[PDB]
Amino acid sequence: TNQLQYLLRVVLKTLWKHQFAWPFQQPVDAVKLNLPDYYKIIKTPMDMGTIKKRLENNYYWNAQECIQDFNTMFTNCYIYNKPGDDIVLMAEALEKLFLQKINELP
Numbered sequence: 604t605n606q607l608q609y610l611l612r613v614v615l616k617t618l619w620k621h622q623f624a625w626p627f628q629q630p631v632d633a634v635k636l637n638l639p640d641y642y643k644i645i646k647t648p649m650d651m652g653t654i655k656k657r658l659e660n661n662y663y664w665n666a667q668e669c670i671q672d673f674n675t676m677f678t679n680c681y682i683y684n685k686p687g688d689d690i691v692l693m694a695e696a697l698e699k700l701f702l703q704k705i706n707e708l709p
């Protein structure tokens with residue numbers, strides 16, 4: 604699929620190089636961040652590092668399964684954190700960029 608290739612080379616690359624990307628490049632380490640309720644509240648943790656590994660290792664059935672992983676990453680952040688928190692503001696900025704790049708999807 605050309606769309607999965609676009610998601611890796613264009614969408615993921617643009618988001619990964621953004622200034623607000625770093626807290627989204629790896630799973631949330633709830634142990635080192637002392638968030639013992641994170642895995643109870645967030646049933647499907649998702650991050651860009653896991654999406655990258657999934658795109659590189661032929662995990663996805665289709666482009667929609669990948670777009671759903673990016674949406675899960677954003678809403679997991681909105682569910683766990685409070686509105687107005689910096690992490691929510693960072694996810695909102697990345698989401699706006701993601702929707703823009705996903706509008707030019709082949």
Ligand SMILES: CCNC(=O)c1cc2c(-c3cc(S(=O)(=O)CC)ccc3Oc3c(C)cccc3C)cn(C)c(=O)c2[nH]1
Nearest residue numbers: 625626627628629630631632636638679680683684685690
């Ligand atoms: C209500 C309470 N919530 C949280 O303290 C909370 C933290 C995070 C982090 C997060 C992950 C890492 S990391 O090094 O593990 C991964 C690379 C490091 C810092 C992180 O956050 C901070 C940021 C961005 C700035 C200042 C301080 C912190 C703790 C990610 N994301 C996606 C979250 O949703 C989330 N929530």
